[model samples]
Target chain A: VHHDGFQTVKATIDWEHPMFKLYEKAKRNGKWNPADIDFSQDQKDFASLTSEEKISALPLVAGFSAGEEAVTLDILPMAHALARQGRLEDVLFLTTFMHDEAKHVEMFSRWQQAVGIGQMDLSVFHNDHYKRIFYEALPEAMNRLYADDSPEAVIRAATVYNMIVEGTLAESGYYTFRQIYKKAGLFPGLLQGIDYLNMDEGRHIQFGIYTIQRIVNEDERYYELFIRYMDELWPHVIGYVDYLTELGKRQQQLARTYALEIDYDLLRHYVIKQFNLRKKQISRTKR
Target chain B: VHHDGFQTVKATIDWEHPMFKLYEKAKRNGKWNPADIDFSQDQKDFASLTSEEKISALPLVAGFSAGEEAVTLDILPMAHALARQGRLEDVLFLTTFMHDEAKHVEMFSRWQQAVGIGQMDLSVFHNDHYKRIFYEALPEAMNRLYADDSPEAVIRAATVYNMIVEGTLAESGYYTFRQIYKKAGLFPGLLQGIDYLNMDEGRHIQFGIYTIQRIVNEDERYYELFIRYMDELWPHVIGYVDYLTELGKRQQQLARTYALEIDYDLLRHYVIKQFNLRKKQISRTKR
Candidate 1:
């Protein structure tokens, strides 16, 4: 006899779909604990840095510490929206997404403590632009899912979370740090943690892209919603990028005495490239 | 230097607490797949049963299948609320709670398909009592956490979820099933799945009680909220209990050839005992 209720064990995954492959890869690769990283060298490396170099790193580190946490806290409603669809594969994959964000938060928190900046007032780093994106925009976008669980709302959330925040801002931040730390050969532990985070985020962005594509494919209105969110959040993201550039310039000027340099142009290039790539991918979802 | 932000490497579980031990036990014991449960015998047994027996079982099976899925979908917000507090052990334990609920949904669905009732319209089983609790009450209580995030809201959600639903209704249902199925020596596969589900829920209830206790301890207002929820939801719970009893009576009256008996009085006793036990545990949190 045919069952009337929701079928539970229907195809666990569409093996042909990219989301399935990404889900399998995430399960295989995304397992890590913040406690395992050896930060002994990071503490010493932080101390050896000139005051100007330390100051330059402060806003970036502080912004990331809170940003990772903001993402972690805000992504739950998105998971709930997906779970309500009763798709087992989607729900299972999103669990890994939430778990990954939590781990990222822990990694950053651990790094802060290990580098002896844990007690420092990182609130100073929350510039207006940074606060607008993380404090106001991210939570507002995600929380909207609870009240209005439309496809439009889900796209808005995914665009803010995956496209703008993780895809553009976080990716650029990682690239900047990886470049600087590798050049200076400093804070190897922090760099290593960032490497794991960056890899995990690659999978997250891939999932986000898949989700937005699926939403837009179902209804073109959701495509418009995605573009709307992108348009609205773009300036806040640009503001954040400008804040980082200005911070970099100050550090570079101060570093003249210390013979250290921050590449504002290179960082800006990476941010633009990341944003453009994400926009192109999202635009493809329209058809 | 002393750290001001949340600590990351704290004990993954407070081994001293029973919740921690339960969490470790869940990790070791809660691993099962619905595909692994052999339902060939269950299919044969179900086909052999009389129409009355089939009808009697339909409501229980359908309600459970939908109810498990509801819990799975709704529990994410509670996990989010806890994660925001940065309590590592609690968050770790809740991951298993969500996983277990998903598995339970899968198990019930598999059972439905195996028993040749997979496509049968079981909406007849969804009495008004079931609809009120699962459809209206549960989601509203849990979703309030997204907007409110108050201790009162958390308590309300837990009261609906753990105390009323899981503690009272689900536990009572399991006991009833075990008694009748064991007495008849019927459908060992279904019984085995229920056994696992029961064990998993024991851990969930333990965590819920711990959470409610902690919240109520923090604020007396939360205790009042818990009591108010229980008072408000008690009638709905009783309505469901009465519906189940009426169903059992009809089955017993019709089954002259079958040696089937459903002790409504015994079931009522079990529910009251369950509620009292939960209330006592929650009351301990008040001091």
Candidate 2:
């Protein structure tokens, strides 16, 4: 609730804490460089595509480039909040998380430039539903941490950030998006970067879960607080998913001429499956 | 500046910026692990030391442990200020800096424990002057960023963080402390950790210089503000050095009974030499 003194020297660091283990795992696995990933094949792949093929590819690029950039900016306030609480171990993990997000920003930007789409106004790719989450809700919950880091405030921040954006949207959509690109047989360079991005993201979700779960266990009232924030934010999450699905339908029809398309039914099932997983993880704290 | 859209997605990142080059170099050099260093021999080396021998090394250990821990908590606000300005490149470099500090905290701690010293309260080693810099002035400058990130505020924050504590005190003293330990021919485990800590500190000082220099270049008036802040802080900076020098004199007196001793004159010259370097770096912006 306040920054009284540093935890490291006052009481000393808890090296055996689960959070310290997370920091170690992050240091070991999170060192991959985004600049090192070559986008050469991705350049040639996009150069040869027809306009319809470009339409299929550009949305994926647009979504990831904006999404990566947004997370990179937004994660800092959460780290500051933890530091105020004197949680040095959690603060350490978040440092690497922000670094991972920054690298993802570069990787996506480099891929966009390689395909010559960087010259255009890429904002046209982000729909209102996408704007609602990344533009409004995401920044709102995160910035609120600066002024109000109450138990209710912390729950709202974590739910909006980890459960909705990262765990639900980013975690669920990255898979469907990667699957579409993979079967289309394009953007090896883009796909290569995703492997590193996902691995880093894997560690990010654990801290989010740990923060939410710890708060709930300390006070059961935060359980309902977590669900309520999730409900308030869920519509925008689904709206963005629907927006992507609708865009996919147009592309699916266009794909009748090309050799590839989205498997909407399978992707839809997985979205619900992922959503249910978020619910199940939080449900342990429900009772 | 108010809360606006993210710089990364709107205007895109400038990869050619000097800050980004610092980030690349940080990623390459900053990956050394504190947990991986072998402390076995250090444990044995300490067990055989006489009573007077322990006094020689304890202050060196205490200074770094407390100093590293202090910076780990304090550096968050500077990064947050940069993010608000939408300076993504500088924010990226800070991510690695905090991680490196967290690792230093662990390395010093593990060394403290390897010599069987983690059991007791270590606060006795920190004098009032040490407490004022780390306990008060540091948190004052850094936490001000959250509330007021004006140009004047930024220079004050960077001045305390980079110019005074890190550059003048940390940069100036780490060499003297290392030379003492090296000549004493003790604690390779501790020395190895210092090697990594110093490498990380090397990148840290550059950011401080870059920050101070950048602010001065942006506004001619801030040139005076930078010097004024440094003057206010320089006394405590030297107070800590004089405290260490006095401790070294005690150790030198104790060494009439032992083989190893302090070279106070050489270390004193270097402190002034390093102080002059900081003054000269900031003077470049003076009209």
Candidate 3:
């Protein structure tokens, strides 16, 4: 049976525990509602893009939108796991994590409506690489948390959620969005939303790293498990990057439109760099 | 596999969805912070209560504090199930449901501290009947959603959580608190928090009614399953009511104090009345 935190209320959540601090930061700063964001200019900006450009953009919006929703759905298991362990501070931080993800889902969905693709079945854009992560790996890691809250299971969940999905995939996806939108000078509202998203993701990434660090500090053996999972999930990241590039190329070919300025080499380079940065932090936190 | 709501962004979470409207009300009216509430006067009030009255009261505070925490932990499964069904509006509304429960946990804990029982093992206050509902039935019904969100499973969960726990027990529990605290003219802070808790629970009860109604409207057969679960759980409610009366009597016996003004017969009567009211609502919504 999971130990409930409220069974004994002696544990004082210090005002400065890293995770609790994040929760406080989120409480103060996480109040931006997606409903309040202005999508009017983005609607105007979208109307000016070439038909193919608009079409190409749908998958990006859809992928992120769908991806955001996936994490929102996926987060509950981890939250429950923390509750099971009676880790009140960690559990409190997770409430903000969930609310953050929920807002991201709303923000992305609103963007879909602004871009006039609200009713489109964006699942078509989710290539097999995307499926491998969101549909398979992401859910598998998180849902395992439902049955197991052991060190092994909890460590694996943080690695998958904080390290892989939020860290490598979302951070890299942000770079791709910035490269495309900044160059094209389009969709200021969507860009603004991503700005909020990336900021929130940064906090989440810090949290997962904290999760990984704390577990690994207890036993160095878990570090190997974290690295193995990272090694395992690395291919899907590259595959997804390649898939995005392939989609851009295909769109231009079919519509005879201007080339989408996607730098395939740099994108791959960034993925490796991002993964290594996350790995090193988890590595260094061992002391 | 659960259908992903964002897979295709076609579903409009109608602004007028009953669940969505509740979410909106929660958004505008649910911003009260537990940390912000003043418990200073309650501290002075608690100091003056006879030791016997205070001893009699510890279990009440502890039971409620612990009960609030259990529901806070128990709600994630239902929220996840709503997401699984691609009910975006319902899913959004549940975010507020969870936030409300978390705040109640804080509110109750704050009250415990004000009354000088913060570190006590409140679990000792949980009688067998309480365990039957919170520890066993509540978790079983909810955790089942982790594996199975079938109509049978979802109906059972709603009946256990909303109908049995929230509807029957909580409403009656509120009556008990109001009677004791109001008659004594004491613990204004605790009573104030319960005021918030009761209001929050009212919204939760309504949402669960909507859950049952929507499912049974699809097929009335589910209503039998709902009724059976309610019938199945009714004994525990009586057992719990009996236990509370027994506890009050024991407190008076052990302390040789004035009687706890518990109207045992009236409490049982209220549970039956509350259950019937909820049953009627589900029955009427079926049409």
Q: Extract clashing residue pairs from model 2.
A: none
lDDT of 2 at A218: 82
Q: Write the per-residue lDDT of candidate 2 for residues B1-287, one digit (tens) a residue.
A: 12345554455667789899998899888778888899998889888777677676677667777788778888988988888787888987887888888888888888877778776556666777878888888889999898899988888988888878888778766787576666766789888887787778888988988888877887777888888888887787777778878887766634554365566777877877887788777755533
Candidate by candidate, in order, the iRMS in Å equals 8.2, 3.0, 3.4
Task: Write down the TM-score of every candidate.
Answer: 0.74, 0.95, 0.86
Model 1 docking tier (incorrect/acceptable/medium/high): incorrect
Tens-digit lDDT string for candidate 1 (A117-194): 766667775667777888788888887876688877778888989999999999998998877776777788888899
Q: In candidate 1, what are the lDDT values of residues B35-153, reduced to their tens digit?
A: 57898888997888788776777777767877887787788878877766655556656766876776677678778777877666666777787788887888888877766787778
Highest TM-score among the candidates is held by which one?
2
lDDT of each: 0.74, 0.77, 0.77
**Ranking of all candidate structures by their DockQ, best first:** 2, 3, 1
Question: Which ranges of candidate 3 are over 4 A from the true structure?
Answer: A1-21, A148-150, A175-185, A246-270, B1-21, B80-88, B182-185, B246-269
Judging by lDDT, tell me the better candidate of 1 and 2. Answer: 2
Model 1 chain A weakest 10-residue run by lDDT? A1-10
Instruction: For residues A163-273, write the lDDT of model 3, one tens digit per residue.
Output: 988899889889988877766667788888888889889889988988888889998888899899899888888888788878876776323333355676887799889
- Rank candidates by TM-score, best first: 2, 3, 1
Give candidate 2 regions above 4 Å deviation.
A1-5, A252-258, A284-287, B1-4, B252-258
